[PDB]
Design a binder for these strands. Structure first.
Ligand code: DTP
Ligand code: CA
Length: 430
DNA sequence: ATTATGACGCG
DNA sequence: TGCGTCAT
């Protein structure tokens, strides 16, 4: 009743760039605009591995992870842009820099949490309060929400997508009580207006389009964002949760897309998020642990408290390269040359990071994979990162892993290494 | 022979 | 502290 929390205390948005690496390449090369196109890395093996795909190309069934040779079978006119290669490896600098462009624009509107190279969470609670004050009871026009969907509407007593969007929006706004500055639904609506403004600024200032979700927490905002892509935003109200969750596969919710979600399904014998409501908090804790159990209990009711962390910069700077099948490094010399290549890229990125962001990494993490291991990583060791010097970093990394060589003959390496990874971590202010 | 990233919880 | 998990 009066004491049952409803998790409607915050307004949180999640902004997610549409087919990001593709847009970066399309801005640069207008020939790629409004075409089926994809971004690929490493042309030689099966045409290269696809890592991003335009919506035009998705219509043909082109997907990430597909080899370009195979994508061409589905879409013979598929256009391709290649990831830059430097020092014998893919180099993602262009995309990291494009990401900074967007993150800096978003930061003008509110504090952001960088979730990935092209996603950020925004806590709009304070901004919404301010905008509500300026509005002073004034109604919110549908014109302020030109690309917004209201999940769950229209409902109750046009056959085209845009017609439906407007019908749903109209029902939502018609029902809104703009009188109360503490109405959660009103707060979400004002949040959506601000996100329209944010997304317009991103597009004006970078050329990039994105989608967004607006709701009361990060999980719902993320879920909302994916409901209407691309180039649209979706408001998921607290009230929309029971219907939305009633047919929502568990794996769709963030953090449940893997083994835990599979266990929830198997152990409880359910399929949809809404079905979770029938278990007590203790029951859920009994199967999935205290933390997960409490999280699931609240989440299936649309409630979650993870804060939007004030963090715009990545916490680590790393680089890695696989050496698959035949290319597996089998000589100390090889291991040393490749560690150096990685270290030179790392040095370059670290030096730029130190100049831009007034911080220095203090720990170097070295990771490798050995042939045959099904695990992404087979090992991880750390050493002090005391100088931004590629030769020193690569020498220290070697020193740290050299004891893995089961070889008897000094020169050779066994078993061959199929992955090298260097990561700078533990930043301090400088 | 997907590959190249990045954050976080358990212990 | 190293590993596993989950995600872009
Ligand atoms: N598994 C991956 N390997 C390498 N790069 C990836 C991988 N997943 C994503 N990326 C890169 C390329 C993407 O353009 C960028 C953002 O990823 P993501 O948001 O998942 O898809 P996307 O932005 O290409 O399409 P969408 O419009 O569906 O968001 O990160
Ligand atoms: Ca994206």
């Amino acid at each position: 009743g009066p004491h049952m929390a409803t998790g409607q205390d915050r307004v949180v948005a999640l902004v997610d760039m549409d087919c990001f690496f593709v847009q970066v390449e399309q801005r640069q090369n207008p020939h790629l605009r409004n075409k089926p196109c994809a971004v690929v890395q490493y042309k030689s093996w099966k045409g290269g591995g696809i890592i991003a795909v335009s919506y035009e190309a998705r219509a043909f069934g082109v997907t990430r992870s597909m080899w370009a040779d195979d994508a061409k079978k589905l879409c013979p006119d598929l256009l391709l842009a290649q990831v830059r290669e430097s020092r014998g490896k893919a180099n993602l600098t262009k995309y990291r820099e494009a990401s900074v462009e967007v993150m800096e624009i978003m930061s003008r509107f509110a504090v952001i949490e960088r979730a990935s190279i092209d996603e950020a969470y925004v806590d709009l609670t304070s901004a919404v309060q301010e905008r509500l004050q300026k509005l002073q009871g004034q109604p919110i026009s549908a014109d302020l929400l030109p690309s917004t969907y209201i999940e769950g509407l229209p409902q109750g007593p046009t056959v085209q997508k845009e017609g439906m969007r407007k019908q749903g929006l109209f029902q939502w706004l018609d029902s809104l009580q703009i009188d109360n500055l503490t109405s959660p639904d009103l707060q979400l609506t004002v949040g959506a207006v601000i996100v329209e403004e944010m997304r317009a600024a991103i597009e004006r200032e970078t050329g990039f389009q994105c989608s967004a979700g607006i709701s009361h927490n990060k999980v719902l905002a993320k879920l909302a964002c994916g409901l209407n892509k691309p180039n649209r935003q979706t408001l998921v109200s607290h009230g929309s949760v029971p219907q939305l969750f009633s047919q929502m596969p568990i794996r769709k919710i963030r953090s449940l897309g893997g083994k835990l979600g599979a266990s929830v399904i198997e152990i409880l014998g359910i399929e949809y998020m809404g079905e979770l409501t029938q278990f007590t908090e203790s029951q859920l804790q009994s199967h999935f642990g205290e933390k997960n159990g409490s999280w699931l209990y609240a989440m299936c009711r649309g409630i979650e408290h993870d804060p939007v962390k004030p963090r715009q910069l990545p916490k680590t700077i790393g680089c890695s390269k696989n050496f698959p099948g035949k290319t597996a490094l089998a000589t100390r010399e090889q291991v040393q040359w490749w560690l150096l290549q990685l270290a030179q890229e790392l040095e370059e990125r670290l030096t730029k990071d130190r100049n831009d962001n007034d911080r220095v990494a203090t720990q170097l993490v070295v990771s490798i994979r050995v042939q045959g291991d099904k695990r992404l990583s087979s090992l991880r060791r750390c050493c002090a990162l005391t100088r931004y010097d590629a030769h020193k970093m690569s020498h220290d990394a070697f020193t740290v892993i050299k004891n893995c060589n089961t070889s008897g003959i000094q020169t050779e390496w066994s078993p061959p290494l199929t992955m090298l990874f260097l990561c700078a971590t533990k930043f301090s202010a400088s």
